[PDB]
Amino acid sequence: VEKDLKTAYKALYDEKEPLKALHLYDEILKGSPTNLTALIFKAACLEKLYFGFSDWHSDATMENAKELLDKALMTAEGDRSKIGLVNFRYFVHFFNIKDYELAQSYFKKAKNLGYVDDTLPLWEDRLETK
Amino acid sequence: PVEKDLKTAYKALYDEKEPLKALHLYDEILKGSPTNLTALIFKAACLEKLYFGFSDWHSDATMENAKELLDKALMTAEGRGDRSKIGLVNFRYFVHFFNIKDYELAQSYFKKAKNLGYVDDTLPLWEDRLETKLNK
Amino acid sequence: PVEKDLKTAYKALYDEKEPLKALHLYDEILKGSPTNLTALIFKAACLEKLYFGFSDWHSDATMENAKELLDKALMTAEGRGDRSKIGLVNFRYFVHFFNIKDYELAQSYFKKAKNLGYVDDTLPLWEDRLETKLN
């Protein structure tokens, strides 16, 4: 699962191929349905596809992404750093759906839970700008 | 019974937000009750959610299957002469064509459903959404 | 064929001025021809037009996807060694950054394209425009 998740992350963020990464996360989630990384990054794929493909640009894709984050919060709450990650992911979900009010709330939640990421200062300034 | 089984399937799709669990609960209802409008209409809803949420479901075949389930629903509703259920099928058609960005056809089914007396508290929200997509 | 399909997609975006129709058409070309530079470059143009014309598309994710399509285009162009197509992708980058008001980065890509021998009849109009925003 560790190697399979690494190959899927590389497809989404390095290769910048969300359709390939989506398939890879679906396969992981077939075997491991409560895997937080697969649930969190499948939502990331769906958010990228919504904003990059006509056939994916529908409320159903965004609803599915939010529901995957909801399922991850359930599992994470059921790991303080992992419970912090989902909150940062909820922030990325709303910074993209233009709701900066809700995004600021999740950004604070993630930071207060001790979420560490080298992109956090770049996100703070972007959130400060919007 | 079918009433309870339909309630469990609706809860799987809209409350639990698990369209794969709901889809097969609806298949089971359609095995015993092939002409059940709720099972036909909401199996198509499952397929629409799966299309937009799973790679292996993101295919024209999935959307074609959803349309064919709505086709079967219109046949049943029209066969009975249930104006109420015909309006509902026509509204579900509008929703299908709205999500596949065919706003021209969706507007036609929206008018059909409204003219058949379809009542839904979400109709003003849909009316404004369709007016925004159709004004561009 | 791909040549006719690309022509219909270009007409949908620039003549018909329907970027959502053109987007679908470019996605279809990219399904069969993933490394087609014209489909890659103009799918990014669609996404750029949608960003600036639709509330539901006005997101950083849309601009990120457009930039990533231009990135994929530079990979393909550089993979072949096509100086012409490398120059074109750099001009397309200048437009991307010019439109998102990052004139510092746009000036860099405009020079890169001109130095790669990019030929376009609109270059003096752009040269005069970029000089106004950068002055």
UniProtKB/Swiss-Prot annotation, chain A:
Cross-link (Glycyl lysine isopeptide (Lys-Gly) (interchain with G-Cter in ubiquitin)): 30
Superkingdom in the source lineage: Eukaryota
Quaternary data: Interacts with SKP1/CBF3D. Part of SCF E3 ubiquitin ligase complexes containing SKP1, CDC53, HRT1 and some F-box proteins. Interacts with CIR1/CDC35.
Record function comment: Involved in ubiquitination and subsequent proteasomal degradation of target proteins. Required for both entry into S phase and kinetochore function. Also involved in cyclic AMP (cAMP) pathway, possibly by participating in the assembly or the conformational activation of specific multiprotein complexes.
Family: Belongs to the SGT1 family.
Note: Present with 1340 molecules/cell in log phase SD medium.
The name this protein goes by in its record: Protein SGT1
Gene designation: SGT1
From Swiss-Prot, chain B:
Source taxon at top rank: Eukaryota
Effect of residue 30 to P: In sgt1-3; induces arrest of cell division in G2/M
SS bond list: none
Residue(s) of cross-link: Glycyl lysine isopeptide (Lys-Gly) (interchain with G-Cter in ubiquitin): 31
Subunit structure: Interacts with SKP1/CBF3D. Part of SCF E3 ubiquitin ligase complexes containing SKP1, CDC53, HRT1 and some F-box proteins. Interacts with CIR1/CDC35.
Function (record text): Involved in ubiquitination and subsequent proteasomal degradation of target proteins. Required for both entry into S phase and kinetochore function. Also involved in cyclic AMP (cAMP) pathway, possibly by participating in the assembly or the conformational activation of specific multiprotein complexes.
Protein family: Belongs to the SGT1 family.
Further remarks about this protein from its record: Present with 1340 molecules/cell in log phase SD medium.
Protein name per UniProt: Protein SGT1
Originating species: Saccharomyces cerevisiae (strain ATCC 204508 / S288c) (Baker's yeast)
Gene: SGT1
Portion held of the full protein: 2 to 137 of 395
UniProtKB/Swiss-Prot annotation, chain C:
Full protein: residues contained: 2 to 136 of 395
Gene this chain is encoded by: SGT1
Subunit details: Interacts with SKP1/CBF3D. Part of SCF E3 ubiquitin ligase complexes containing SKP1, CDC53, HRT1 and some F-box proteins. Interacts with CIR1/CDC35.
Keyword Flavoprotein found: no
Residues spanning the signal sequence: none
GO biological process: kinetochore assembly; protein quality control for misfolded or incompletely synthesized proteins; protein-containing complex assembly
The keyword Ubl conjugation is assigned to this record: yes
Record's protein name: Protein SGT1
Miscellaneous information on this protein: Present with 1340 molecules/cell in log phase SD medium.
Family: Belongs to the SGT1 family.
Molecular function terms, GO-annotated: protein-folding chaperone binding; protein-macromolecule adaptor activity
GO CC, one annotated term: ubiquitin ligase complex
Crosslinked positions (Glycyl lysine isopeptide (Lys-Gly) (interchain with G-Cter in ubiquitin)): 31
Function in brief: Involved in ubiquitination and subsequent proteasomal degradation of target proteins. Required for both entry into S phase and kinetochore function. Also involved in cyclic AMP (cAMP) pathway, possibly by participating in the assembly or the conformational activation of specific multiprotein complexes.
Keyword tags: Cell cycle, Isopeptide bond, Phosphoprotein, Ubl conjugation, Ubl conjugation pathway
Organism: Saccharomyces cerevisiae (strain ATCC 204508 / S288c)
Coiled-coil residue windows: none
